[PDB]
Amino acid sequence: SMNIYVGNLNYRVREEDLTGLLQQYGAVTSARVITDRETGRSRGFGFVEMEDENDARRAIEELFDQEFQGRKLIVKEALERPE
Ligand SMILES: [Ca+2]
């Protein structure tokens, strides 16, 4: 497994958009956009879990520094952490 941090996101980026992006490289088991507790609105970052570490590292290597919906991605291995 690998937990992937995705950040500097267009605030319109949804969980399904993150899954859509990362599932191109391998199986995705979880996708979460972190939101403001009161407004419920995206804070511009989230986490995607992929079942295969090798596919996750591949996704990070390909996606590094690419723009997504008008903003340069932050895409990096995250600390494995429960929700
Ligand atoms: Ca690990």
Coordinates of C-alpha atoms in Angstrom, one line a residue, residues 5-79:
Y5 CA -0.5 13.4 -0.6
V6 CA -2.0 15.5 -3.4
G7 CA -1.9 19.3 -2.9
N8 CA -2.0 22.8 -4.4
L9 CA -5.3 21.7 -5.9
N10 CA -7.8 23.8 -7.8
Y11 CA -10.6 24.1 -5.2
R12 CA -13.0 22.5 -7.7
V13 CA -11.0 19.3 -7.6
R14 CA -13.3 16.5 -6.2
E15 CA -12.5 13.1 -4.7
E16 CA -13.7 11.5 -8.0
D17 CA -11.2 13.7 -9.9
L18 CA -8.4 12.4 -7.7
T19 CA -9.4 8.8 -8.1
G20 CA -9.8 9.4 -11.9
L21 CA -6.2 10.8 -12.0
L22 CA -4.5 8.1 -9.9
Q23 CA -6.4 5.0 -10.9
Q24 CA -4.7 5.4 -14.3
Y25 CA -1.6 3.9 -12.7
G26 CA -3.0 1.1 -10.6
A27 CA -5.8 0.2 -8.1
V28 CA -7.0 3.0 -5.8
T29 CA -8.6 2.0 -2.5
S30 CA -9.3 5.4 -0.9
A31 CA -9.6 9.0 -2.0
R32 CA -10.3 12.0 0.4
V33 CA -10.3 15.7 -0.1
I34 CA -9.7 17.5 3.2
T35 CA -12.3 20.2 3.9
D36 CA -12.9 23.1 6.2
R37 CA -14.8 21.9 9.3
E38 CA -17.4 24.7 9.1
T39 CA -17.9 25.4 5.4
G40 CA -17.4 21.9 4.2
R41 CA -15.3 23.3 1.3
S42 CA -12.1 21.9 -0.1
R43 CA -8.8 23.1 1.5
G44 CA -7.0 22.3 -1.7
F45 CA -5.4 19.0 -0.7
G46 CA -6.1 15.4 0.0
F47 CA -5.0 11.8 0.1
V48 CA -5.2 8.9 -2.3
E49 CA -4.3 5.3 -1.2
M50 CA -3.1 2.9 -3.8
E51 CA -2.9 -0.9 -3.1
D52 CA 0.4 -1.4 -4.9
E53 CA 3.5 0.6 -3.7
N54 CA 5.1 0.2 -7.1
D55 CA 2.2 1.7 -9.0
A56 CA 2.0 4.6 -6.5
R57 CA 5.7 5.4 -7.0
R58 CA 5.1 5.3 -10.7
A59 CA 2.2 7.7 -10.4
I60 CA 4.2 10.2 -8.4
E61 CA 7.1 10.0 -10.9
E62 CA 4.9 10.7 -13.8
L63 CA 2.7 13.3 -12.2
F64 CA 5.5 15.3 -10.6
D65 CA 5.4 19.0 -11.5
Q66 CA 2.5 18.6 -14.0
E67 CA -0.4 21.1 -13.9
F68 CA -3.8 19.7 -13.2
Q69 CA -6.9 21.9 -13.6
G70 CA -4.7 24.9 -13.9
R71 CA -2.4 24.4 -10.9
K72 CA 1.0 22.7 -10.5
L73 CA 0.4 19.4 -8.6
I74 CA 1.9 18.6 -5.2
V75 CA 2.2 14.8 -5.4
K76 CA 4.3 12.9 -2.9
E77 CA 4.4 9.9 -0.7
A78 CA 2.6 10.5 2.6
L79 CA 2.9 9.0 6.1

